[PDB]
Copies of this chain bind each other. A is one copy, B any other.
């Protein structure tokens, strides 16, 4: 049921922000890639759009802590989500 799946992808995206605030940047990246992959297979653009919103919030959190490396990492996942969004 794709609606249970939408809820699952939404929760993963929110945890991306939570983990950026914690400095667990690689884990947040992992969660965002799994949102992208799962959303591109099941063709759900709105899950990707929400992911992009949340990725912007994670950039906020990392800038606030002056972590440029984490910002780079998050921004790579951002560009990937933008490509996948365009194709959906």
Residue tally, chain A, CB below 8 Å to B: 18
Decide yes or no whether A56 CB sits under 8 A from chain B.
yes
With A45-B46, A82-B10, A82-B14 as contacts: A3 and B53 at CB distance below 8 Å: no
If the complex has contacts A57-B56, A82-B10, are A87 and B50 also in contact, measured as CB distance less than 8 A?
A: no
Find the residue from A14, A46, A49, A86 having the highest chain B CB count within 10 A.
A86
Residues of B within 8 A of A87 (CB): 3, 7
CB-CB < 8 A to A57: which residues of B? 56
The 9 closest A-B pairs by CB, nearest first: A10-B86, A7-B86, A6-B86, A52-B53, A45-B46, A49-B49, A14-B82, A50-B85, A3-B87
Q: List 16 A-B contacts (CB under 8 A).
A: A3-B87, A6-B86, A7-B86, A10-B82, A10-B85, A11-B86, A45-B46, A46-B49, A49-B49, A49-B50, A49-B53, A50-B52, A50-B82, A50-B85, A56-B56, A56-B57
